[PDB]
């Protein structure tokens, strides 16, 4: 039916329409504090805030402000946390918070350099034997192995609490080929990525949530998330017909403004979720065909 409705908009050649109508009726809540001047620097995009009523509050008595929302998804029971790239002056906030909600996985859908400009700070380790320490929140970071395909990565990371030594594995998933106010090269290779982070227990409710980023933190970021909703709300009852993608992102856009910034990443999200659907469905075959269409090696 999202697959009726998708050959009904291509036909009419509607997208844009259909995405400004999500635009225009999208939440509109208060974003106080992130716009406080002492927050200023806190904030890469002037343009895109965290809602006050759903921002992520760091537990320090000094400023406990972070542009990072709480998408909590009650119907399909997962919740992300969506956020900016961290800049030069929060990667230790951006770790703190991993910290704090309890996070077992971190997903960067963008890369630190993008179009010539500086999108994202370097806030993890690329080398084993250089070890990052974050003095403002007391945290270190050790980077405990990479795993490299042809266009996404996974780390393995050690973050030490050093006021108590405790010591917690992250996962990070770097996707490198998705360009900024664009889709990814395939539904195939967008899913094979998604089902990776699936396969690594980040998205268990077992963990805190998943802290998804791009640089702004609201359309790639956007994109993944309503992607893996929807899949999810069809994986509980088998319906694939029960799913209404456009009252899903609304449904976000009250935890985020601005999830997906383009109609095409819209009508990518339907073409990942209908092809996402075979696997929901009882094919398990197409998941290999996925990690063969996307190319993943070498
Ligand atoms: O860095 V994003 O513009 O895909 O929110």
């Not at 956020?83 to 770790?95: I, M, R, S, V």
């Not at 929140?137 to 050790?142: A, H, P």
């Not at 050690?158 to 108590?164: A, D, G, S, V």
């Not at 970021?221 to 992607?227: D, H, N």
């Given at each position: 039916?999202?697959?009726?409705e ?5 036909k ?10 999500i635009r225009?009726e999208?939440?509109?809540f ?7 001047p002492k927050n ?5 995009y002037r ?5 006050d ?11 406990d402000?972070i542009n990072?929302s709480?998408?909590?998804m ?29 996070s ?7 890369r ?8 994202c ?5 690329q080398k084993?034997?250089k070890?990052?320490?974050?003095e403002?929140?007391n945290?270190?970071?050790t ?8 266009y996404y990565t ?10 108590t030594q405790?010591?917690?594995e992250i996962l990070?998933f ?5 360009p900024?106010f ?6 195939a290779?967008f899913?094979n990525?998604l ?10 409710p077992?963990?805190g949530p998943?802290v998804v980023?791009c640089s ?7 994109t993944?998330c309503?992607?893996?909703t929807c899949?999810?709300?069809?994986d509980?009852?088998?319906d694939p ?7 899903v992102?609304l ?5 985020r403004m601005?999830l997906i ?15 996402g ?6 094919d398990?075959?197409?998941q290999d065909?996925?990690?063969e269409l996307?190319?993943?090696d070498?």
């Amino acid at each position: 039916e999202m697959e009726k409705e998708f050959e009904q908009i291509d036909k009419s050649g509607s997208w844009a329409a259909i995405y400004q109508d999500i635009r225009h009726e999208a939440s509109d809540f208060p974003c106080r504090v992130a716009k406080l001047p002492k927050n200023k620097n806190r904030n890469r995009y002037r343009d895109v805030s965290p809602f006050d009523h759903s921002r992520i509050k760091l537990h320090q008595e000094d400023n406990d402000y972070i542009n990072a929302s709480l998408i909590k998804m009650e119907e399909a029971q997962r919740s992300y946390i969506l956020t900016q790239g961290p800049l030069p002056n929060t990667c230790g906030h951006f770790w703190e918070m991993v910290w704090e909600q309890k996070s077992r996985g971190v997903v960067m859908l963008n890369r630190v350099m993008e179009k010539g400009s500086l999108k994202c700070a370097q806030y993890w380790p690329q080398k084993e034997e250089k070890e990052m320490i974050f003095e403002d929140t007391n945290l270190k970071l050790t980077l405990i192995s990479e795993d490299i395909k042809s266009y996404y990565t996974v780390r393995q990371l050690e973050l030490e609490n050093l006021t108590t030594q405790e010591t917690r594995e992250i996962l990070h998933f770097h996707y490198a080929t998705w360009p900024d106010f664009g889709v990814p090269e395939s539904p195939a290779s967008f899913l094979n990525f998604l089902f990776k982070v699936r396969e690594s227990g980040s998205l268990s409710p077992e963990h805190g949530p998943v802290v998804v980023h791009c640089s702004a933190g609201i359309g790639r970021s956007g994109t993944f998330c309503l992607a893996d909703t929807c899949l999810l709300l069809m994986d509980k009852r088998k319906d694939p017909s029960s799913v209404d993608i456009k009252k899903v992102l609304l449904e976000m856009r009250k935890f985020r403004m601005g999830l997906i910034q383009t109609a095409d990443q819209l009508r990518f999200s339907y073409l990942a979720v209908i092809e996402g659907a075979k696997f929901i469905m009882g094919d398990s075959s197409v998941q290999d065909q996925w990690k063969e269409l996307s190319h993943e090696d070498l």
